[PDB]
A paper describes a structure:
The protease-sensitive VP4 proteins protrude from the outer capsid shell, forming sixty spikes that are responsible for host receptor interactions. Each VP4 protein is cleaved by trypsin into two domains, VP5* and VP8*, corresponding to the stalk and the distal head of the spike protein, respectively. The distal VP8* head interacts with RV host glycan receptors for viral attachment, while the VP5* stalk assists in viral penetration into host cells. The RV VP8* domain adopts a classical galectin-like fold with the central structure being an anti-parallel β-sandwich formed by a five-stranded β-sheet and a six-stranded β-sheet.
The VP8* of P BM11596 strain adopted a classical galectin-like fold as similar to other known VP8* structures, with two twisted antiparallel β-sheets consisting of strands A, L, C, D, G, H and M, B, I, J, K, respectively. The specific interactions between LNFP I and P VP8* were revealed by the crystal structure. The Galβ1-3GlcNAc type 1 precursor in the LNFP I-bound P VP8* inserted into the pocket formed by W81, M167, A183, T184, T185, R209, E212, and appeared to be stabilized through hydrogen bonding and hydrophobic interactions. The Gal-IV moiety was stabilized by F168, Y170, and W174 through hydrophobic interactions and the terminal Glc-V moiety was stabilized by Y170, S172, Y187 though hydrophobic interactions and N171 through hydrogen bonding. The Fuc-I pointed away from the protein surface, consistent with the STD NMR results. Some key residues involved in the binding pocket in the P[II] genogroup are highly conserved, e.g. W81 in the βB strand, W174 in the βJ strand, T184 and T185 in the βK strand, R209 in the βm-αA loop, and E212 in the αA helix. From the recent X-ray crystallography studies, it was found that P, P, P, P employed the βα binding site to accommodate H type 1 ligand LNFP I, which is consistent with our NMR-driven HADDOCK results.
Author numbering:
A (entry chain D), B (entry chain C), D (entry chain B): 2 to 159
C (entry chain A): 2 to 160
The structure:
Amino acid sequence: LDGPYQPTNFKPPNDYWILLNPTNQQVVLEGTNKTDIWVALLLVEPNVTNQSRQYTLFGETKQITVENNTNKWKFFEMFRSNVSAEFQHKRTLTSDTKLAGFMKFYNSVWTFHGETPHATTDYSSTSNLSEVETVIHVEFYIIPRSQESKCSEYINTG
Amino acid sequence: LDGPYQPTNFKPPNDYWILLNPTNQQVVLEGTNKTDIWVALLLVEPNVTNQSRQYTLFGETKQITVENNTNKWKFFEMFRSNVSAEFQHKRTLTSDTKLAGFMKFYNSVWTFHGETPHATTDYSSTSNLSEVETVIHVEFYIIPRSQESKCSEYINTG
Amino acid sequence: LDGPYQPTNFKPPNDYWILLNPTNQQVVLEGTNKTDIWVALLLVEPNVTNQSRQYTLFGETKQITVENNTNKWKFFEMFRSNVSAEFQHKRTLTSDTKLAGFMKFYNSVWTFHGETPHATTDYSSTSNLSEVETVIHVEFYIIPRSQESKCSEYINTGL
Amino acid sequence: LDGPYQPTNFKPPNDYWILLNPTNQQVVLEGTNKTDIWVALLLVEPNVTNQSRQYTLFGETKQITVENNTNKWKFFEMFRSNVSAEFQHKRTLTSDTKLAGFMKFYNSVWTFHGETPHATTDYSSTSNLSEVETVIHVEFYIIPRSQESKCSEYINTG
Ligand SMILES: CC(=O)N[C@H]1[C@H](O[C@H]2[C@@H](O)[C@@H](CO)O[C@@H](O[C@H]3[C@H](O)[C@@H](O)[C@H](O)O[C@@H]3CO)[C@@H]2O)O[C@H](CO)[C@@H](O)[C@@H]1O[C@@H]1O[C@H](CO)[C@H](O)[C@H](O)[C@H]1O[C@@H]1O[C@@H](C)[C@@H](O)[C@@H](O)[C@@H]1O
């Protein structure tokens, strides 16, 4: 656990997790290589009735549908592979820890999804992992992949 | 265990789980009241690369991007509350079992989501539950909400 | 399995079961938001002939007729929706496990009723769920709604 | 099945089930010996919001609170053992058959309670069983106690 770090932008190094530690930022992280991957993590608070909210993603103003019927926080992982496409709601991380993850590894972009305390890893695929750069809007930490079991413990139990 | 029943277009009774038992149908279920709820369950088999597939939802042809990196099956739950809107990927049921659920209950439509064996129920809201009808493209079973534990057990372990 | 917790007076979190484990307490649980829901669980031991017993519910003394013809324990679920109304005997849980359940979920209070090992949930509606507070007179456990099928298993077949 | 019989006021014989077959009556049965047994079965249709309803029981105007969250019918068993006492809601039969039972046997008045198809018998005891008389508001059948397993089948499955 290296940190905490203040909000910044950088190409996270390969084989390390970024552990994201929002307070109430709407947009937690923007990641793109400007070719074939745009990923954004949106934070929806508990007890949100189905509505359209405005988010600024990669400088573009977007209306995205959100709902949270639970007493947990939901990270909406929004994804597109074309600069011109609309975002898809690809994954959800449902959390009473309010921690999320981002990693560049094995030509993939890895996140956590599902509901704490059983949240697990999945990925999106790229031909251009080296060019993936993240704007991180929250305090964060850096955990090596050799220590993912601790990262998964912090995501699931805090 | 009540069934199996053949695929049909019908109004499911309130307070019963429809336990859906597909082989490899693309579109498992289409539910709508034609006013404020459209829900479709799409079945995505293991080891699908990011790709746009065609699905006919309520007589509308849709090009929907899907991905499954896993050796499990995924039910993509597509949702909208307006006839003129595009479908959003609301939820995912990642399944060892290839079973999914649908129930009209207590003013809401209920489905399962998450990853087996930890799939859980959540709802979508409507002011018009009584007119919600389903096209079911798969063989199904009917479980009373009273036996919701048995339905969770089938969803989670087969 | 989260607990045991000691008897207490607190505001149970939404979307968790409280699993109530009495010995011989008369009043197991008293839940109210002081506006539109009062729920009390009374515990009537096996082989009780028709009789009036005294209970203190929400600091008021009540005379409630009870009976239990069985070798199982009965949780009498007493209810009202008005501070000015009398309690009615709304539900019964007939139990070999001596376990009962309470949950705040989906704008409702949820309890178990019927007879082990086939007890099922039902609900009481409220305009103000989050103000429901509970005096719990017994040892208890906490089970997330995500694990309700475990809670149902415990209710029906025991700890 | 001995019947059908039309609604009537009579003294049922001991060791016979009266199988009650309501349509839409508020009050199914009023039984008393005018000494230590008063029992009324009220019928409450599906999807009834907590409300105060009016019933005439043994000539008395009563306001009783009822609720039925379910899509089954509920028989509210109302009891007292003194003519000047309030009724208590002693038992419920939650039913998709709409069949209920009444029997004078041994030292007791018997009814069904619980939820179909798991409905079971229970009793109220009396020192005056032979003077128990019933106003039956509904079509009914008579079944000997020797055939109670058929009575339980009918109550539970139709
Ligand atoms: C256990 C049993 O047989 N219960 C049935 C009940 O039997 C009553 C009679 O045996 C009666 C003597 O003739 O004794 C009653 O016991 C009490 C008195 O009521 C009480 O006043 C007194 O103070 O103490 C005595 C103790 O002797 C018994 O309760 O009769 C019921 C009325 O017909 C009948 O419904 C009940 O049958 C059982 O009920 C449950 C729920 O409905 C299940 O179906 C059981 O399977 C069922 O038992 C089965 O049927 C009966 C006829 C009998 O053959 C059982 O062996 C059989 O399993």
